[PDB]
Design a protein around this ligand. Sequence first.
Ligand code: HEM
Ligand code: HEM
Ligand code: HEM
Ligand code: HEM
Lengths: 146, 146, 142, 142
Amino acid sequence: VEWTDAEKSTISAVWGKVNIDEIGPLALARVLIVYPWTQRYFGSFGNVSTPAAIMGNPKVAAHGKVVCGALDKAVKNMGNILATYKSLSETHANKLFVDPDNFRVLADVLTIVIAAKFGASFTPEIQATWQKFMKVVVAAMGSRYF
Amino acid sequence: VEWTDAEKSTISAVWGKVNIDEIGPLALARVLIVYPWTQRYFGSFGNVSTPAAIMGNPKVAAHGKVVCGALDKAVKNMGNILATYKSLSETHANKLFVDPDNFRVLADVLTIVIAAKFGASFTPEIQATWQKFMKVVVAAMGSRYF
Amino acid sequence: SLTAKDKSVVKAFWGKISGKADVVGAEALGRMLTAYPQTKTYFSHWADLSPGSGPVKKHGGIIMGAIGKAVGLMDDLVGGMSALSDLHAFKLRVDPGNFKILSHNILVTLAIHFPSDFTPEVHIAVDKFLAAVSAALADKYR
Amino acid sequence: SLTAKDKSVVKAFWGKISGKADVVGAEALGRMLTAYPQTKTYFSHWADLSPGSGPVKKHGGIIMGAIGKAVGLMDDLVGGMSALSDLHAFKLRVDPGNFKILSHNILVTLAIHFPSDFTPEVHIAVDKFLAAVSAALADKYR
Ligand code: HEM
Ligand code: HEM
Ligand code: HEM
Ligand code: HEM
């Protein structure tokens, strides 16, 4: 997408303050609780029934780190996010069968967890650039659904 | 967007059978009736209160031809729809203040009117290519909203 | 929020459409899978997801059937739709946003098969009703 | 579809948030206009649409106010929200889909100001309630 250098700086600055170990687990677990139908893909993870269960499931936490870790490549390739996630988009579409609208609520929830952790330093202006980035990421993750 | 020649042929074939004089008015008037809040931009057109009123308003019909006529350029520039509608997107954003989600329900309604007029020749496969095209057009119309 | 006018319109149009409901279902599902391929993610066990395939044709009549049943339950769709909601909510776990996609493909098919009967007036009422069936089905999700 | 648990959660969280509601409103509106610039189309008469502008700060407290009022009307939001629906539906003609955008910007602001209090449990309930206020407001559109 067409990105300015300032935009690029903002996104790297936000991602610099992100603790993958804290934010992934929280973001992922909050998605499973607020939109409980997304639990249908996490059958092998054991009990993802309740918040309490969800929030203490180790496989959930581990997966949260994986998902959030994968954003690093988006963060580091802002010129070509589409192409960087092509392959990832095909395993989601063809091996995992994740409804791509699910990437949209995840993006919203991640944003919400980030706001909780950054507080007031997550300014409206920063949130606007983060939301433009989230939108390209979401679109990239849902691009190989045919 | 990346379009194949077959896709390009499909879209031109559909647009070849479209009667701008019949389809614009119908599409526009059906939008104003099914999503009645879009009437708020058509104040100068007189009475757009009821279906009956809407369906006989000449200014509505005229505008329907204009809107639908403007798709010709999308149809003829499938490589660069974004750039072809840049200017149009700025008058909508800055002079008319049309909510861009409005372009989405229009696209749906147009598709519905086209299906009614083509009948069974509007195959699922054709509708799939028409929907990919509609999506680029909608995105292009909402691209200069800042 | 169905008004009595909405309900009388849906009922007058439905009596006219009821003989082709299986055809309409089959085709709306087919159209949805093909034009909105993200919905194909819920039917990955099915052999053929093409328009006209058996799985598709059978499942579409089942869905239309439930909607025709909903025309009789318009007074209490939430309560009427309760058990199917439960199913979609806890067994199938279908993201609710897919209900609107199906709805749009149903309107496209209705226009196609009943272009003269599918007027603006019929259009707005059936759209509201499909939205209310979607809402009823979504009710128990969380 | 608010359950009694949903309502008790919204009520326990709201008592805790009520003193900063104007701040929360002002900031959620500000965030929406800036991060979702398509919503700016409804406020084109306003002099300044920036976060912290007067128009924004005033209007956001007005919107939060109506929502705080909705916490007391949770039993009948459709009926409770009736007059404001009418307004949004016939005077303002605000596309209903903008209600969900505002809702998301309200959750972001709540997380920011009440990160410890805004738990998952609080999150899901308030999201449902905001969705139900949106629905109530949208009710009379057509
Ligand atoms: C924000 C966008 C997302 C990114 C970047 C992402 C990233 C990943 C990665 C890197 C993997 C590892 C597997 C592989 O290499 O193929 C994965 C697997 C997976 N993801 Fe996604 N994911 C995202 C969103 C989602 C969402 C929203 C869901 C479910 C609602 C989901 C469900 C899964 C599942 C079930 C697996 C495989 C689990 C396993 O076998 O360990 N992902 N994801
Ligand atoms: C499908 C996408 C659309 C296209 C291609 C389109 C095209 C046009 C064109 C070519 C004009 C002429 C004015 C100019 O040159 O600046 C116009 C004006 C206008 N359009 Fe759009 N339009 C679209 C969607 C919409 C929708 C959905 C609405 C309202 C809900 C709308 C409302 C208007 C209004 C109110 C005017 C100006 C009326 C006048 O002063 O005559 N348009 N549009
Ligand atoms: C909104 C209107 C809908 C209605 C009235 C409806 C109704 C039904 C009914 C009645 C059944 C099972 C019939 C029986 O067991 O007797 C069913 C199953 C199912 N529906 Fe829904 N449905 C709707 C929307 C959807 C949508 C939009 C999707 C996917 C995007 C979906 C996915 C499924 C699946 C995957 C099954 C079971 C699959 C199988 O049998 O292999 N449904 N639905
Ligand atoms: C969903 C929650 C909402 C609530 C509770 C709400 C409530 C209100 C109230 C109470 C007023 C007028 C106050 C009075 O006259 O006493 C108002 C006015 C207005 N609202 Fe809404 N609103 C909501 C969402 C929105 C959204 C999402 C938009 C735009 C996207 C919007 C646009 C407006 C506008 C343009 C006005 C009047 C503008 C002006 O005064 O210059 N509202 N709203």
